[PDB]
Structures are given as C-alpha cells and as structure tokens.
C-alpha cells in the first residue's frame, strides 16, 4: 500500500542515529503548523543487541541483548523506507509528540520502546530488525 505506515521498519538516514533501524509509530502525511515538512515520528534502536553464541553463561547472555532505544521525529527524506514491517503496539499513550516537552516523560518513551524491542528480541520474530546494518 502507501508505504509509510505506523508498522513499517525505517532506516534513519541522517542525524546522530545515522544508519540505526527505526519503526514508525505515527506518519503525518501533510505538514502540521509546527513541522511544515511531511514528517513521521519513529521509535528506533540506538545500541543494538550483540551477536550471542551457545555455551555462554545464563547471566552473561542477560547482559548482551540490552536494546537501548530512542524516540525521534524525522522527515520522509531523512528516513529510508524498507519492504520490512514490525507487528508492535507502541501505544500512543506513551510514544507521543506530547513527550517532547518534558525530559522526565522522554525517559518513559525511551523505556517503553526499550522493553517492546527487548522482550520481542527473544522471540526470533523480526530478526533482521535487531541485527545492525553493515557499513
């Protein structure tokens, strides 16, 4: 369909997180009065879960796959859309544009995306999405 959905995986193209994988939670097809460019809020993965190996410790593996997430508004042309998509809720109640007023609220959207990328990393579903891009 119209390939900028609230479920699409998305390569972050510029900024601090250049090359990080992101999933759109909100597409804003027209320009809002604040952001006149056509934009889409993403919640991506800053620090990736590492390549894990068999005959490691139980407590050791629990240190490796610690997703550190981010949450950010980007443009449609500061992002690269992919054919991949992730089935993830990421509720509007937390992951929201109301969260860019308080740095205390933003520790929860960074924490909300963190969990739902962590506790669905151990599934093996969307295993492309958690392996870092090679450049």
């Amino acid at each position: 369909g119209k390939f900028m959905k609230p479920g699409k995986v998305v390569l972050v193209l510029a900024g601090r997180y250049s090359g990080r994988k992101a999933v759109i939670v909100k597409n804003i097809d027209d320009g809002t009065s604040d952001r006149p460019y056509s934009h889409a809020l993403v919640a991506g993965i800053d620090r990736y879960p590492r390549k894990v190996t068999a005959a490691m410790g139980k407590k050791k593996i629990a240190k490796r796959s610690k997703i550190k997430s981010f949450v950010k508004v980007y443009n449609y042309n500061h992002l690269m859309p992919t054919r991949y998509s992730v089935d993830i809720p990421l509720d509007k109640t937390v992951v929201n544009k109301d969260v860019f007023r308080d740095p205390a609220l933003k520790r929860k959207a960074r924490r909300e995306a963190k969990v739902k990328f962590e506790e669905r990393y151990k599934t093996g579903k969307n295993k492309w999405f958690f392996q870092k891009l090679r450049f």
Partner: protein, 62 residues
C-alpha cells in the same frame, strides 16, 4: 564541518567533542556520502536476498 581547522599535533590538547561530530563516521566522512553509503549498504544487501530467492526456483523443476 564541526571539526577545528588546526595544526595536526595540536589535537592532543583538543577535547574529544572538538575533534569529531556526533554521528556514525562523524569527523572522518562527510554526512552527504554517509547517507549514500547507508542506502547502498542496504539496497545492495536487499538485492542479495532476491538472488537468495531466485536460487530457490531454478533447481526445483529438474
């Protein structure tokens, strides 16, 4: 841009933040040809999976 134009042996003194911009390949490569080497690093990798899928055709019919 974002890196000080200075004598090379001065950079021992300069802090880490003076010497690199906060990005992947930051202070080593230009942001324009970073975002060409993010797309290519993906679109070439996508093209490899089309070869992985077209290899899953031509042997199953003989």
């Amino acid at each position: 841009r974002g890196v000080r134009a200075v004598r090379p042996k001065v950079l021992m003194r300069l802090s880490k933040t003076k010497k690199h911009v906060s990005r992947a390949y930051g202070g080593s490569m230009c942001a324009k040809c970073v975002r060409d080497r993010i797309k290519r690093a993906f679109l070439i990798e996508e093209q490899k999976i089309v070869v992985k899928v077209l290899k899953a055709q031509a042997q199953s019919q003989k």
